[PDB]
Write an enzyme that holds these catalytic residues in place. Structure first.
Site, PDB file in Angstrom:
ATOM      1  N   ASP A  39      11.754   9.187  -6.657  1.00  0.00           N
ATOM      2  CA  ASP A  39      11.107   8.488  -5.397  1.00  0.00           C
ATOM      3  C   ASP A  39      12.035   7.162  -5.429  1.00  0.00           C
ATOM      4  OD1 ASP A  39       9.989   8.015  -3.088  1.00  0.00           O
ATOM      5  OD2 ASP A  39       8.318   6.934  -3.944  1.00  0.00           O
ATOM      6  N   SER A  97       0.960  -1.111  -0.105  1.00  0.00           N
ATOM      7  CA  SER A  97       0.027   0.191  -0.068  1.00  0.00           C
ATOM      8  C   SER A  97       0.855   1.219   0.084  1.00  0.00           C
ATOM      9  CB  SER A  97      -0.920  -0.160   1.219  1.00  0.00           C
ATOM     10  OG  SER A  97      -1.963   0.625   0.798  1.00  0.00           O
TER      11      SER A  97
END
Lengths: 6, 289
Positions: B127, B16
Site C-alpha cells: 500500500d 480514517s
C-alpha cells in the site's frame, strides 16, 4: 481511487 | 476522562481508513502526544492485532514508528503509536502540489531504503502511497517514515527464504491510483510491486497528478478498470515526458523484475543519486517546505 482495498 | 490503556487520553479523530480510525492521544504520564488506532472488535475480519505484530518485528528499523501499547478495550482493538509529523501528501498539498526535483530525489532515496528494509524483514507493504510516508519530529524532521502495515504480508519464509507461490485471479489490493500493472491484472504481489508503486508516487510528485487520476465512472468497479486500462495504455515514456530519463528507467526496471526476483535497490538509488549530482544539488535536507 485512493481508498485502501483488501 | 476517556482513556485507552488506562494511560492515553483520546482526542479528536485525525484520520480514517479501511482498517480502523486514527485518533490523537495524550500520554498522561509524560504529556507525549501519540496516535491511537481503533478497530471495531465486531469487524468481520480482525487485522489490528496482526499489524501490531508486524510493527513489533520492524522495531529498531530506521524510519519505523515505535508502537507504545497494544490491547483490547470495550468494543475496540487498540494500537497506540508514536506520533509523527505530516505525511508526504500533506506536504505536497501544502506546497500547492509542486515538488522541486531536488525534493523528489531526496525523498526517493529514503523511500527506496524504507521499502528495502521492510523486504529484508520478509514482508511486502502492498500500500505504497504518499499518505503512508510521514516526516519525523524535531531532530528527526528530515527522516522519512513508513506507516500502515494493514495490508502487509510475508512474501518469503523467515528461515528458508522460500518465496510465496505465484498465482493469478487475485482481487485488487492496495490503492487503485498507485497499484502496479501486475496488481491490476490479478497477479500475486511481491517485492517488485512495492517498488513500481513508488515509481508512480515519484511521477505523481513530479506532475501534480497522474493521467489515470479523476476518471469519471459510475459503479466503483468500472472506475477501477477505467484506471487499469488507462494505466496500461499509457506508455512509461509518455507518462514521464518532460522529466529526466531516470524516472522512466526506474519504472521500466521494476516492470522487468520477475515475480520472485530480488530487486537491485542499490542500482535504483544510484540512478537518482547520479542524477542528483548532475543537477548540482547539495544533500542538505533542505526540502521545498
Amino acid at each position: 481511487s485512493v481508498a485502501s482495498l483488501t | 476522562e476517556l482513556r485507552v490503556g488506562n494511560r492515553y487520553r483520546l482526542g479528536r479523530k485525525i484520520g480514517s481508513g479501511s482498517f480502523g480510525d486514527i485518533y490523537l492521544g495524550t500520554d498522561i504520564a509524560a504529556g507525549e502526544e501519540v496516535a491511537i488506532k481503533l478497530e471495531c472488535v465486531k469487524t468481520k475480519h480482525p487485522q489490528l492485532h496482526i499489524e501490531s505484530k508486524i510493527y513489533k518485528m520492524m522495531q529498531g528499523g530506521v524510519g519505523i514508528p515505535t508502537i507504545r501499547w497494544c490491547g483490547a478495550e470495550g468494543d475496540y482493538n487498540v494500537m497506540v503509536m508514536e506520533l509523527l509529523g505530516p505525511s508526504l501528501e500533506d506536504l505536497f498539498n501544502f506546497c500547492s502540489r509542486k515538488f522541486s526535483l531536488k525534493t523528489v530525489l531526496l525523498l526517493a532515496d529514503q523511500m527506496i531504503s524504507r521499502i528495502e528494509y521492510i523486504h529484508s524483514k520478509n514482508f511486502i507493504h502492498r500500500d505504497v502511497k504518499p499518505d503512508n510516508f510521514l516526516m519525523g519530529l524535531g531532530k528527526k524532521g528530515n527522516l522519512v517514515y513508513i506507516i500502515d502495515f494493514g495490508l502487509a504480508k510475508k512474501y518469503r519464509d523467515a528461515r528458508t527464504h522460500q518465496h510465496i507461490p505465484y498465482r493469478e485471479n487475485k482481487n485488487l489490493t492496495g490503492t487503485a491510483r498507485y497499484a502496479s500493472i501486475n496488481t491490476h491484472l490479478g497477479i500475486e504481489q511481491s517485492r517488485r510491486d512495492d517498488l513500481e508503486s513508488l515509481g508512480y508516487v515519484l511521477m505523481y510528485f513530479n506532475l501534480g497528478s497522474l493521467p489515470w487520476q479523476g476518471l469519471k465512472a459510475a459503479t466503483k468497479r468500472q472506475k477501477y478498470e477505467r484506471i487499469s486500462e488507462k494505466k496500461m495504455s499509457t506508455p512509461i515514456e509518455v507518462l514521464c515526458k518532460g522529466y529526466p530519463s531516470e524516472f522512466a528507467t526506474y519504472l521500466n526496471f521494476c516492470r522487468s523484475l520477475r515475480f520472485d526476483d530480488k530487486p537491485d535497490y542499490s542500482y535504483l538509488r544510484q540512478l537518482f543519486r547520479n542524477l542528483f549530482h548532475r543537477q548540482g544539488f547539495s544533500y542538505d535536507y533542505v526540502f521545498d517546505w
